[PDB]
């Protein structure tokens, strides 16, 4: 192998949003000998793999975009407000084409192991094919929502049909027309598939373990007026977006739902309902919706009244009504609840009627057979830690990341890990809960500036255990003051049997994150030893 034996300054793991910019920064902007690695055959990460029907971003294309190339930031002709998967993938390919990244990426190359060599001051990487690559620094951009999860029901051998994984959709597009199709899952992926295929399949069986509080997305044209605002001052727009908590293209509300009149609550929620977008409904309306049960109930009572008015069959309306708080990743899709009024859609509550096993012709659900041609798993991810822990990662004195993270992840600022020198993450665990591209850019700029500083001397970046544990503690405390603390979902690991259930996010928003990180940088990179 020509790769075998290669010696790099920087290895970038991943060629999604994070890895592409990380590689551009170290190779093109900083002039380092750097290459990327991805098990995918091309760039795009998320947008390369998730080719399922209806896949689309929930962040407006004004903010789900790079800003580092100011020409593309102001002039890329996004076709609509919320870009579909193919368009995002096309954009990432155009970025990689323009900046010569593909020639510096080793595609179809999975990193199986990385081991710190203290005397050599290098990381030794082993690919799945057994090739050895060394790098002074590793920038790990393997994604928080990249390790697919799907239950394996008994007797799959008996089933004559197809079982598809939405997050690793087949490269040859499946034929769904006229078929009996089951969808397992009603998170963001499931609701996109459901609304995309309901009028194409012969019959759609929605296998719903837990309904969530869906609001409209507001699919529509690209906001020309925001783009005019950007062109006055694209850096100012970028900086404004980063100053918000979620970086979703709006200012979060500072008004408590409980300090206004009932008429104002109704006005605000109706306005947000017509505007669309789940993050806006949860955060642009009032300030305390995911904080107190009383405020949360004003929002869910509103959504419940919509469900009841839309869904013709009352029992179906009740099955679509969650019992949990509105305290998961907020969901949005257009014409969602109306789907259940179709004569070819059946909703199954598979908490009350569990999926028991496969049969020859379908699936057993609460004691009755549901005949299926196709079963689509929209079941999410071993989130946050899944793909980090798939790389055997050996740090100082042989310490294994698998052991360090045995009770949950521990990391400093979502970018470094104590006992793993010169290993930097893009948007790792304990990052802020934000839209990702503009925040990836900010983090990449922060960590590559640390690399450049390290390269002026010894070339060693170590992170303090105490700083890491204090960062983790701040994230735990922030979660513990919200309803996310008492609402199980992938956000706290509860969706994976056996997985530690714990806080894994910084909860102060991007504005608060940057303030903390800038204070750390100003205090001679407190918690880092460079």
Ligand X SMILES: Cc1cc2nc3c(=O)[nH]c(=O)nc-3n(C[C@H](O)[C@H](O)[C@H](O)COP(=O)(O)OP(=O)(O)OC[C@H]3O[C@@H](n4cnc5c(N)ncnc54)[C@H](O)[C@@H]3O)c2cc1C
Q: Give me the residues that bind ligand X (CB under 6 A), please.
A: 13-14, 16-19, 37-40, 45-46, 48, 50, 55, 57-59, 64, 110-111, 141-143, 145-146, 189, 387, 391, 426-427, 435-436
Number of residues engaging ligand NAP in binding (CB under 6 A): 23
Count other C-beta atoms under 10 Å from residue 358's C-beta: 22
Bridging pattern class, strands 105-106 and 111-117: unpaired
SS3 208: strand
Q: How far is the CB of 51 from ligand X (least distance, A)?
A: 10
In the list ligand X, ligand NAP, none, the entry touching 378 (Cβ below 5 to 8 angstroms by class) is ligand NAP
DSSP class of residue 320? T
Q: Which stretch binds ligand NAP (CB under 6 A): 188-196, 239-247, 429-437, 464-472?
A: 188-196
d(CA 504, CA 316): 35
Question: Quick check: 378 binds ligand NAP (CB under 6 A)?
Answer: yes
Q: CA 500 to CA 523: how far, in whole Å?
A: 34
- Closest residue by Cα to residue 39 from 49, 52, 51: 49
Indicate which of ligand NAP, ligand X, none lies near residue 184 (CB less than 5 to 8 Å, by partner kind).
ligand NAP
Tell whether residue 187 is a contact of ligand NAP (CB under 6 A).
Answer: yes
- Ligand-binding site membership of 213 (annotated): no
With binding defined as CB under 6 A, does residue 184 bind ligand NAP?
A: yes
d(CA 247, CA 143): 18
CA nearest to 143, candidates 225, 49, 224: 49
Which entry of ligand NAP, ligand X, none binds 18, CB below 5 to 8 A by partner kind? ligand X
Closest separation in Å from C-beta 491 to ligand X? 13
Has 39 been labeled as part of a binding site? yes
Residue 17 interacting entry, from ligand X, ligand NAP, none, C-beta within 5 to 8 Å by type: ligand X
| Under rule CB under 6 A, residue 357 binds ligand NAP | no
50/468 with CB nearer ligand NAP: 50
Taking a C-beta distance cutoff of 8 angstroms, is the pair 298, 324 a contact? Answer: no
Q: How far is CA 384 from the centre of its chain?
A: 9
Q: Is residue 329 a contact point for ligand NAP (CB under 6 A)?
A: yes
> Which one of residues 279, 427, 490, 513 is an interface residue with ligand NAP (CB under 6 A)?
490
The 206-225 site mask, x for binding ligand NAP (CB under 6 A), equals ---xx---------------
Smallest distance from the beta carbon of 311 to ligand X, in angstroms?
A: 26
Among residues 248, 263, 243, 252, which one has the least CA distance to residue 287?
252
Between CA 501 and CA 492 the distance in angstroms is 5
379 is in an annotated binding site: no
Annotate 453-488 with DSSP letters as a single string: HHHTTT---EE-HHHHHHHHHHHHHHHHTSGGGGS-
If 0-12 CB within 10 Å is exposed, 13-18 middle and 19+ buried, where does residue 157 land?
A: exposed
Using CA atoms, how far residue 18 sits from 29, 428, 438, in Å, is 15, 10, 10
For 54: left if phi > 0, alpha if psi spans -120 to 50, otherwise beta; the answer is left
199 is in an annotated binding site: no
Least distance to ligand X, CB of residue 451, Å = 18
**Pairing verdict, β 34-37 and 6-13:** parallel
Which does residue 478 touch among ligand X, ligand NAP, none (CB within 5 to 8 A, set by kind)? none
The one among 379, 416, 419, 422 contacting ligand NAP by CB under 6 A = 379
What is the number of other CB atoms lying within 10 angstroms of the CB of residue 148? 18
140 binds, among ligand X, ligand NAP, none (CB under 5 to 8 A by kind): none
Give the binding site for ligand NAP (CB under 6 A): 56-58, 145, 151, 184-190, 192, 209-210, 329, 350, 378-381, 490, 495
Which residues are annotated as part of the binding site for NADP(+)? 58, 186, 189, 209-210, 329, 490
Q: Which residues are annotated as a binding site for FAD?
A: 18, 38-39, 46-47, 49, 58-59, 111, 436
């Amino acid at each position: 192998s020509k790769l075998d034996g290669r010696k790099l300054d920087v290895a970038v793991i991943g060629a999604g949003v994070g890895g592409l910019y990380a590689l551009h920064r170290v190779k093109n902007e900083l002039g380092m000998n750097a290459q990327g690695f991805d098990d995918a055959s091309g760039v795009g990460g998320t947008w390369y793999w998730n080719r399922y029907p209806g896949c689309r971003v929930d962040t407006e294309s004004t903010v789900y975009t790079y800003s580092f190339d100011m020409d593309m930031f102001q002039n890329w002709e996004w076709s609509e407000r919320y870009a579909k998967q193919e368009e995002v993938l096309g954009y990432l390919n155009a970025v990689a084409d323009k900046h010569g990244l593909k020639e510096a990426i080793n595609f179809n190359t999975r990193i199986a192991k990385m081991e710190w060599q203290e005397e050599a001051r290098r990381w030794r990487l082993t690919t799945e094919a057994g090739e050895t690559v060394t790098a002074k620094y590793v920038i790990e951009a393997v994604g928080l929502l990249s390790s697919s999860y799907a239950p394996q029901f008994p007797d799959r051998d008996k089933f004559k049909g197809e079982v598809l994984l939405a997050s690793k959709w087949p490269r040859d597009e499946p034929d769904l027309a006229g078929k009996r199709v089951g969808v397992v899952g009603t998170g963001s992926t499931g609701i996109q598939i459901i609304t995309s295929i309901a009028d194409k399949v012969g019959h759609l069986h929605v296998l719903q373990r837990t309904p969530q509080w869906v609001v409209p997305l507001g699919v529509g044209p690209f906001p020309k007026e925001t783009r005019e605002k950007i062109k006055r001052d694209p850096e100012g727009f970028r900086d404004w977006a980063l100053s918000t908590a979620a970086v979703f293209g709006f200012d979060e509300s500072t008004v408590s739902a409980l300090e206004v009149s009932e008429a104002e609550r109704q006005r605000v929620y109706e306005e947000a309902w017509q505007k669309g977008n789940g993050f806006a409904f949860m955060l642009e309306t009032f300030s305390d919706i995911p904080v107190t049960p009383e405020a949360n109930k004003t929002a869910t009572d509103f959504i419940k009244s919509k469900i009841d008015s839309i869904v013709k069959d009352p029992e179906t309306a009740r099955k679509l009504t969650p019992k949990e708080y509105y305290a998961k990743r907020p969901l949005a899709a257009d014409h969602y609840y109306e789907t259940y009024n179709r004569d070819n859609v059946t909703l199954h509550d598979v908490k009350a009627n569990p999926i028991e096993r496969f049969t020859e012709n379908g699936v057993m659900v609460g004691g009755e057979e549901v005949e299926l041609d196709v079963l689509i798993m929209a079941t999410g991810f071993d989130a946050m830690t899944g793909n980090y822990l798939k790389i055997e990662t050996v740090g100082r004195d042989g310490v294994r990341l698998q052991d360090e993270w045995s009770d949950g992840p521990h990391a400093y600022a979502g970018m470094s890990i104590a006992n793993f020198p010169n290993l930097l993450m893009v948007f790792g665990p304990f990052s802020p809960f934000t839209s990702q591209p503009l925040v990836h850019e900010w983090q990449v700029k922060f960590l590559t500036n640390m690399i450049q500083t390290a390269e002026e001397g010894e070339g060693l970046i170590e992170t303090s255990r105490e700083a890491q544990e204090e960062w983790v503690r701040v994230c735990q405390e922030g979660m513990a003051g919200t309803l996310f603390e008492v609402t199980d979902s992938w956000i706290n690991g509860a969706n994976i049997p056996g997985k530690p259930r714990t806080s894994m996010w910084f909860m102060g928003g991007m504005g608060g994150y940057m303030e903390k990180m800038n204070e750390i940088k100003a205090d001679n990179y407190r918690g880092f030893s460079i």
